[PDB]
Amino acid sequence: PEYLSLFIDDKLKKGVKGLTEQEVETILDKAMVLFRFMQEKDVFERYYKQHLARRLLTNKSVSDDSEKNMISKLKTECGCQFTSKLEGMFRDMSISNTTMDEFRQHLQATGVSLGGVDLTVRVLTTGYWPTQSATPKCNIPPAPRHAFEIFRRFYLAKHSGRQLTLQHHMGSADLNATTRKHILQVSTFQMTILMLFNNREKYTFEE
């Protein structure tokens, strides 16, 4: 079931595999027929949810339509056991983008620090997404740190009823480097090391 989930993730993320929607519908029907003669649906659902988290917390615009086909096939195959939670975390992603718009409007009204420019912050719930390991306690690069502070303040003043937690094992960023100005990309893992390098170069593992 894990390999089946990986295959369906590869077919659902990479649009090259299966160009015209004609051969896509047939291949999805064949995949669900193959899954019909399969046991241990729990691990399949768990890995499908993990793949959903991987594909929705990364670059979007993957299909913006095939998700409806996937959930419709799941409804006619699994039923109403875990599909409801799937559409619930999809609604969480809608809540995420609405709160991103809210933080944009907050930077528009205030935005004290320049760190809060185009903040693509997202808001999710602990129950839906498997983010129970949301406690990497690490330092944040000055400007992004100030941006996070501002966002927290705004969201709280808005619905004062949520305990926002800080984490690093999710998301991405665009690092503008500088003969031309080529913008790099850091997946919230290299931001602290690169910020320390900016503060002072010639560091090592001990530093």
From the CA atom positions of the chain, what is the Rg in Å?
A: 20
Least CB distance from residue 90 to other proteins, whole Å? 14
| Region 143-202 residues binding a second copy, contact defined as CB under 8 A | 149, 152-161
Breaks (C-N over 2.5 A) in the chain follow: 178
**By the criterion CB under 8 A, which residues form the site for other proteins?**
15, 19-21, 57, 61-65, 85, 88, 96, 99, 115, 117-128, 130-132, 134, 141, 143-144, 147-148, 151-152, 155-156, 161-165, 167, 170-178, 183-184, 188, 191, 194, 197-198
CA 187 to chain centre: 11
* Amino acid at the residue 84: S
Contact at 8 Å (CB) between 17 and 11?
Answer: yes
116 binds a second copy (CB under 8 A): yes
- The residue with tokens 């939670």 is 85
Residue 64: name its binding partner from a second copy, other proteins, none (Cβ under 5 to 8 Å by kind). other proteins
C-beta closer to a second copy: residue 133 or 176: 176
Q: Is 64 among the residues that bind a second copy (CB under 8 A)?
A: no
Kindly provide the b/e burial profile for residues 180-200, where b requires at least 16 CB atoms within 10 angstroms of the residue's own CB.
eeeeeebebeebbebbeeeee
Contacts with a second copy by CB under 8 A lie at: 102, 104-112, 114, 116-118, 149, 152-161
